[PDB]
C-alpha cells in the first residue's frame, strides 16, 4: 500500500508581493537617493539557470515598479527638509534685460530686490540673475514664478543629483526570476528563465520623452505596450544600438553667496564671465535616421504592411511633457524636440541641434504631497553631458481607421514608464517548501 | 483595426416582448442609452458586466464576435436610442 510522506524544501514557488530592500555598491559622497543605508552587494552575482521550466511573466501588473515609484518620491522629498528654505524670496523684483543686441533677447533677467540681513532690523539691496521661466509680471516689477501655490525651498547644495545604480534584493523565502528570452514582449510566457539574488544596475534617471542611460535590447528593436488598440496607452520602445547625445550649457556662470539669516545662505547667480549663449543638444543625423528606420520596420508588425507611419512633435501640456527634460550636471534642461520627430515614412557629419531652456524652480511629484517646490542652485562653470538614447515613449493618435496613416507623437509625464523599461524582465515569487507525495515507506513504530 | 456592423437599423416592436439588437466588433464594447437631446447613459460595459444604478431588466452576453443586448419587460420610459461603443468608434444606433 502507498503512504504519504512529508518533504521539506521542494522547489515550488507562488506569486506574491513583498517589500524588496536596496543594495548599493562599494564606497571608494551624498545624494538625494540614500545610498548609504543600503546593504553592500556581493562582488559576484549568483545566477542559477533554471531548465525545463516555462514561467509566465506579466508586465504592467508588477509590484516592483509600483514600489520603486514610491521609493524615489520618499527620497526626493525627504532631502529638501533639513537645509534652508527660501520663504523670504517672494519679494517684488526689479528686473532689467541683459542682452543689448536684440535678435534670445529676454531669456535672462537682471533682478534686484531687498533681502533680509542676518540682523533682522536692516535690509540689503542685492541683485541676481533669473531666467524668464522663473519670473512673471505682476501688473519691470516682476516676482518669482508662482509665489502663491508653493513654498519654495532651496535644493540642498552638499547632496548630488547623480543617478548611481541601485539594486533591489529579495528577503529570505522569496526569489526573483529573470526572463532571458529575446523575442519576448511585455505579457506572455518565458521559456528561458533563470533566478538571481537580485537585479542588475538600475539607474533612477528622470526623463520624459527619451529614455537616457537605460538597458538596451539584444537582437532587434523591441516595441512593448499594454495594448496597441487602446490609444491611451504609451508605447514603449527599446533600442538595440545606442544613440549618443551631447548636451551642454556654454554659459560660464558664477555663484555668489547671500546671507539671508543666521546661518542660512542663498546661492544667487552673479555675473556671467564670457559670451551669452544658449544651451543646446546634438544628435547624429545619420544615426537618427538609421535608428528611426528600424522602429518603423518593427511598428509595421502590429499594423498593416503598406501603411504610412508619420512622426509629429508634441501636441501640448505643461513644459515637462512637451519638451525633453533631464538633469544634466545638476541643472534642469527643457529641450525642444521638433527636429527629431519630424518625418514621414512611405512604405517601400551633420548634427541636429536641439534648442533647450534652463529652469531653476522645479515642482515634481505633485508638490511632494502638500505644496513643496524646489529651487536648484546655479552650478559654477560650463556643464557638458554625454549620454545614450536607449528608447522613446510614443503615443499614437486615435480616430485613424482609413487612408492607412498612423502618426506617433512623443509623450511621458508618468514617471513609472521610465522604470517599466528596466523592471520588465523581473518577477518576485514566494517559496512554498512544504509538499506531500505517496511513497512505499512506513513509520517505524 | 476595428470593424463595425449594425444590422438592426430600425425596429418598432410593441411593449412586453423580448427584443435583441446585435453588433459585431472586436475588442471591448460598451452599451449606451441616449434620449432625444439628452446626454447618453452607460447601461452595461465589457459586454456583460452591469453598471450600478441600471435596473435588472437589462442583460447582455457575448459569443465570439457577436454582442447581444436583451430587452425584456419593456417600459413606457424605456424607448430611446441604443448603440455599442468601441473606444473611438461609435455607430449611429437605432430607435425603438
Amino acid at each position, epitope marked *: 500500500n502507498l503512504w504519504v510522506t512529508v518533504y521539506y524544501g521542494v522547489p515550488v514557488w507562488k506569486d506574491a508581493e513583498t517589500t524588496l530592500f536596496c543594495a548599493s555598491d562599494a564606497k571608494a559622497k551624498h545624494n538625494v537617493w540614500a545610498t548609504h543605508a543600503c546593504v553592500p552587494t556581493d562582488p559576484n552575482p549568483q545566477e542559477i539557470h533554471l531548465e525545463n521550466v516555462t514561467e509566465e511573466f506579466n508586465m504592467w501588473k508588477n509590484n516592483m515598479v509600483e514600489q520603486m515609484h514610491t521609493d524615489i518620491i520618499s527620497l526626493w522629498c525627504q532631502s529638501l527638509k533639513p537645509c534652508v528654505k527660501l520663504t523670504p524670496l517672494c519679494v517684488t523684483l526689479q528686473c532689467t534685460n541683459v542682452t543689448n543686441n536684440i535678435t534670445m533677447r529676454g531669456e535672462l533677467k537682471n533682478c534686484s530686490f531687498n533681502m533680509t540681513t542676518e540682523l533682522r532690523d536692516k535690509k540689503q539691496k542685492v541683485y541676481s540673475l533669473f531666467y524668464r521661466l522663473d519670473v512673471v509680471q505682476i501688473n519691470k516689477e516682476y516676482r518669482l514664478i508662482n509665489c502663491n501655490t508653493s513654498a519654495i525651498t532651496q535644493a540642498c547644495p552638499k547632496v548630488s543629483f547623480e543617478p548611481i545604480p541601485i539594486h533591489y534584493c529579495a528577503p529570505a523565502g522569496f526569489a526573483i526570476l529573470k526572463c532571458k528570452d529575446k523575442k519576448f514582449n511585455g505579457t506572455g510566457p518565458c521559456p528561458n528563465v533563470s533566478t538571481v539574488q537580485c537585479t542588475h544596475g538600475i539607474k533612477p534617471v528622470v526623463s520624459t520623452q527619451l529614455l537616457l542611460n537605460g538597458s538596451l535590447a539584444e537582437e532587434e528593436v523591441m516595441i512593448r505596450s499594454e495594448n496597441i488598440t487602446n490609444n491611451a496607452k504609451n508605447i514603449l520602445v527599446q533600442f538595440n544600438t545606442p544613440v549618443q547625445i551631447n548636451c551642454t550649457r556654454p554659459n560660464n556662470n558664477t555663484r555668489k553667496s547671500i546671507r539671508i539669516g543666521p546661518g542660512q545662505a542663498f546661492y544667487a547667480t552673479g555675473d556671467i564671465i564670457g559670451d551669452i549663449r544658449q544651451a543646446h543638444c546634438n544628435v547624429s543625423k545619420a544615426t537618427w535616421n538609421e535608428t528611426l528606420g528600424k522602429v518603423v520596420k518593427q511598428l509595421r508588425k502590429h499594423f498593416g504592411n503598406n501603411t504610412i507611419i508619420r512622426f509629429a512633435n508634441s501636441s501640448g501640456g505643461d513644459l515637462e511633457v512637451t519638451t525633453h527634460s533631464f538633469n544634466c550636471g545638476g541643472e534642469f534642461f527643457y529641450c525642444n524636440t521638433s527636429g527629431l520627430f519630424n518625418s514621414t515614412w512611405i512604405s517601400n557629419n551633420d548634427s541636429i541641434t536641439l534648442p533647450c531652456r534652463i529652469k531653476q524652480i522645479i515642482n515634481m511629484w505633485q508638490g511632494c504631497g502638500i505644496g513643496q517646490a524646489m529651487y536648484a542652485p546655479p552650478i559654477q562653470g560650463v556643464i557638458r553631458c554625454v549620454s545614450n538614447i536607449t528608447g522613446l515613449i510614443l503615443t499614437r493618435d486615435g480616430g485613424s481607421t482609413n487612408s492607412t496613416n498612423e502618426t506617433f507623437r512623443p509623450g511621458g509625464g*508618468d514617471m513609472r514608464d521610465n522604470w517599466r523599461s528596466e523592471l520588465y524582465k523581473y518577477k518576485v515569487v514566494k517559496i512554498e517548501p512544504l509538499g506531500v507525495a505517496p511513497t512505499r515507506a512506513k513509520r517505524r513504530v | 483595426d476595428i470593424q463595425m456592423t449594425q444590422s438592426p437599423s430600425s425596429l418598432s416592436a410593441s411593449v412586453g416582448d423580448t427584443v435583441t439588437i446585435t453588433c459585431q466588433a472586436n475588442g471591448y464594447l460598451n452599451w449606451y442609452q441616449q434620449r432625444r437631446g439628452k*446626454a447618453p447613459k452607460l447601461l452595461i460595459y465589457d459586454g456583460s458586466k452591469l453598471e450600478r444604478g441600471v435596473p435588472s431588466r437589462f442583460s447582455g452576453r457575448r459569443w465570439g464576435q457577436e454582442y447581444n443586448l436583451t430587452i425584456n419587460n419593456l417600459q413606457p420610459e424605456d424607448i430611446a436610442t441604443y448603440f455599442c461603443q468601441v473606444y473611438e468608434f461609435v455607430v449611429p444606433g437605432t430607435r425603438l
Partner: nanobody
Amino acid sequence: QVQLLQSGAAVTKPGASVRVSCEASGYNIRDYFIHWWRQAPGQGLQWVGWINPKTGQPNNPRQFQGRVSLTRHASWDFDTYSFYMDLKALRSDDTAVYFCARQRSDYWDFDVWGSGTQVTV
C-alpha cells in the same frame, strides 16, 4: 456627488473662436481621463479627443489637428478642475452639441457625462 458641470450655449460667426467649459468637482480628477464628444443633429456621436488631467497632453484625430486645443486648469487646492475646448476656425458644418465624458477604466466606461453645449455658426 460626482458631477461634471457644463457651460452655456454660444452663437458665433464662421471664422470666430469658441470655448466650452467643463468642471469636475466630486471625485479624484487626476486618476481619470476626460474625453470630449460631439454629435451633429441627425447623426451619431463623433470623437473629439481626450486630455490627461495629470500632465495636460491632448490627443486629436487627423480631421481635428490644428483647430481644437484641449486645455485644463486646476485650482490651488486641487479639488475642482476646469476643462476647456477652444476651436480655432469653425466651419459651416460645426453646428453641433459638445459633451464632456469621463473614462473610468481600461474598458472606456463613460459613466458620467455633461449637460451638453450646442453651438452654431
